[PDB]
Amino acid sequence: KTRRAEVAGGGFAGLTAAIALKQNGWDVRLHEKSSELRAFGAGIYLWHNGLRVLEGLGALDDVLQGSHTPPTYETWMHNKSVSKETFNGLPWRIMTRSHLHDALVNRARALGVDISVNSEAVAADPVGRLTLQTGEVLEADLIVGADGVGSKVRDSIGFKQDRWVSKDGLIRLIVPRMKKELGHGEWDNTIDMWNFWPRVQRILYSPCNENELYLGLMAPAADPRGSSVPIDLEVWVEMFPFLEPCLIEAAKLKTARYDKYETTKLDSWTRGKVALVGDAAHAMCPALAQGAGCAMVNAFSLSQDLEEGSSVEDALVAWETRIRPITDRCQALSGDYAANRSLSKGNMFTPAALEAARYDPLRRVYSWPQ
Ligand SMILES: Cc1cc2nc3c(=O)[nH]c(=O)nc-3n(C[C@H](O)[C@H](O)[C@H](O)COP(=O)(O)OP(=O)(O)OC[C@H]3O[C@@H](n4cnc5c(N)ncnc54)[C@H](O)[C@@H]3O)c2cc1C
Ligand SMILES: Cc1ncc(C(=O)O)c(CO)c1O
Numbered sequence: 435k436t437r438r439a440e441v442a443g444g445g446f447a448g449l450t451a452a453i454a455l456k457q458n459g460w461d462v463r464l465h466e467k468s469s470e471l472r473a474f475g476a477g478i479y480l481w482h483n484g485l486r487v488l489e490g491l492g493a494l495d496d497v498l499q500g501s502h503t504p505p506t507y508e509t510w511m512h513n514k515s516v517s518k519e520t521f522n523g524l525p526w527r528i529m530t531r532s533h534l535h536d537a538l539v540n541r542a543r544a545l546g547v548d549i550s551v552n553s554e555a556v557a558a559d560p561v562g563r564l565t566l567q568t569g570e571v572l573e574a575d576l577i578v579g580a581d582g583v584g585s586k587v588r589d590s591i592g593f594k595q596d597r598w599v600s601k602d603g604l605i606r607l608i609v610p611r612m613k614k615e616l617g618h619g620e621w622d623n624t625i626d627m628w629n630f631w632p633r634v635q636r637i638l639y640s641p642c643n644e645n646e647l648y649l650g651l652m653a654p655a656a657d658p659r660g661s662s663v664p665i666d667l668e669v670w671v672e673m674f675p676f677l678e679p680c681l682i683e684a685a686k687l688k689t690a691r692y693d694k695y696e697t698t699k700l701d702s703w704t705r706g707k708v709a710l711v712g713d714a715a716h717a718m719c720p721a722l723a724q725g726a727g728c729a730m731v732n733a734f735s736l737s738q739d740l741e742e743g744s745s746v747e748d749a750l751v752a753w754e755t756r757i758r759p760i761t762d763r764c765q766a767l768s769g770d771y772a773a774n775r776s777l778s779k780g781n782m783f784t785p786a787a788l789e790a791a792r793y794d795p796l797r798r799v800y801s802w803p804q
Contacts, residue, residue: 436461437740439576440564442555442587444471447712447729448580449538453491454737456545460576464547465566467554467581473535475693476606477640477648479723480534481791482525482802487730488537490796496537501529502643507624509780512631517780518623524791524802528624528640528648530608555581557590560706562746565590576746577708580733583696585714593710594701600719603694604652605663607684611647615679627674628778635660635673647680655694663690695720697769703758704750709736718765719772724790728761731795738795764790 439455441448444466452464480488480497488494503526506518542549554567558579564572564587579587588595613621625639634657640648651670653660659669667685671678684690698717703710712729739753740746767787776782785804792800 437576438574439463439578440572440574441465441578441580442558442564443578443580443582443585443712443714444468444549444551445473445580445582445712446534446538446726447714447733448578449535449542450487450491450730450733451578451580451711451736452547453493453538453542453545454734455576455740456542456547457491458737458741460740462547463572464542464549465553465555465564466549466551467567469552471535471539471549471551473531475531476608476650477642478529478531478534478726479640480527480529481723481727481788483724483791483793483795484727484730485525485527486794486796487734490734491538491541493537493541496540497529497534498527500533500643501527502622502641503527504622504624504641505620507626507783508620509626509628509777511628511778511780513627513629519781519783521783521788521791522802522804524788524804526791528642530642530646530648533642554586555579556586558587558708560591560708562707575707576740578733578736579708579710579714580712581714583698583713583717585710587708588700588710588714591705591708593705596697596699598697600695602652602654603661603692604650605661605665605690605692607649607651607687607690608642608646609649609680609683609687611641611645612679612683613644616676619676626777628775629673630778633657633660633669633673635669637670637674637677639677649677649680649684651684655692661692663692664688665690697765699762699765703754704747707746707750709750709753711736716761716765718761719768721771721777722764722768722787722790724764724768728764728790731790731793732757732761734795760790760793
């Protein structure tokens with residue numbers, strides 16, 4: 435009598451899906467292919483939409499404790515401040531990835547979500563079957579493909595996919611704030627530090643709390659010094675000398691990686707009893723800082739549509755129809771911003787840019803008007 439769900443992927447999308455379903459009385463098992471539950475990418479921004487998902491998941495308190503809302507989101511071009519934005523009170527937050535992940539994992543475990551590590555999904559059947567790498571076949575009423583950009587769940591079924599890969603990437607790190615050492619300034623702000631001269635180098639400066647600073651060091655792949663890991667300290671200090679104390683700390687991180695990005699748009703997100711959520715369905719450009727935000731909204735919204743008394747297959751179709759346009763629009767605008775380097779101008783968090791952020795998944799309305 436109890437509905438059973440199998441979720442592939444222990445990232446933000448899968449954990450959100452698992453918690454939301456479990457709260458609604460589903461028996462839920464989650465599979466993570468890695469040997470342990472961990473989140474990579476150093477730091478992350480969430481906004482009102484994702485904070486509302488966290489509220490709905492009962493995971494908000496653990497997130498807000500030990501995370502940070504800057505006094506303002508500031509943009510520089512060539513060390514000149516070009517904008518300071520506060521989004522008319524719209525809630526937002528910066529945190530380490532591990533901080534968000536821990537909150538979600540703790541909540542999943544408190545609810546009794548069955549979590550299997552070293553467990554890899556390699557195929558899904560729309561009739562409600564999930565196959566693991568070992569050969570084990572699991573039957574369920576709902577299968578969730580939350581297994582990231584290279585989703586085997588998705589690819590085992592076959593979806594029409596618009597794929598794009600970025601030639602350029604960035605190096606994302608957590609370092610000590612070194613706040614005292616930074617001297618005079620507004621070092622609690624988000625500061626997006628753009629430059630095109632003398633070279634294309636950018637740092638997104640993102641405090642996570644009183645102890646930890648999230649840095650995104652961005653340079654073209656064709657730049658053999660700026661794209662180097664561990665970081666080429668000299669070329670970063672040269673263009674960002676006011677961050678030297680933090681950059682010296684960053685240079686100690688020998689695990690640093692230069693990560694490129696892909697985007698994904700699919701003809702649909704569903705097939706029978708299989709739903710694709712998160713990057714598996716809709717990986718996007720990071721300009722609007724909404725990749726995980728949309729992923730969490732979508733995973734949460736999936737649980738909502740499964741409460742309507744419909745068959746799982748109909749609920750999944752209804753879910754995509756209801757919730758997908760917010761993501762399609764956000765993904766498109768982020769792509770345009772990225773292609774045009776729009777954020778470099780500052781003042782670009784317009785009402786349209788903030789549309790995904792303004793969405794409240796709990797009440798299903800748009801809040802915090804701009
Ligand atoms: C540079 C950059 C910056 C970003 N900044 C932000 C930001 O500030 N704010 C924001 O909201 N979003 C941001 N995003 C986007 C965000 O990182 C993603 O949208 C989000 O992490 C997607 O989560 P997911 O759970 O869908 O996928 P993933 O995070 O990829 O997680 C899937 C989980 O999949 C597990 N797995 C993979 N294959 C299998 C398998 N076969 N079987 C079982 N498990 C499997 C993976 O190991 C992992 O544990 C950023 C993205 C990039 C690239
Ligand atoms: C929060 C954020 N905003 C914008 C961008 C961007 O691509 O301009 C990135 C990439 O790291 C971000 O992480």
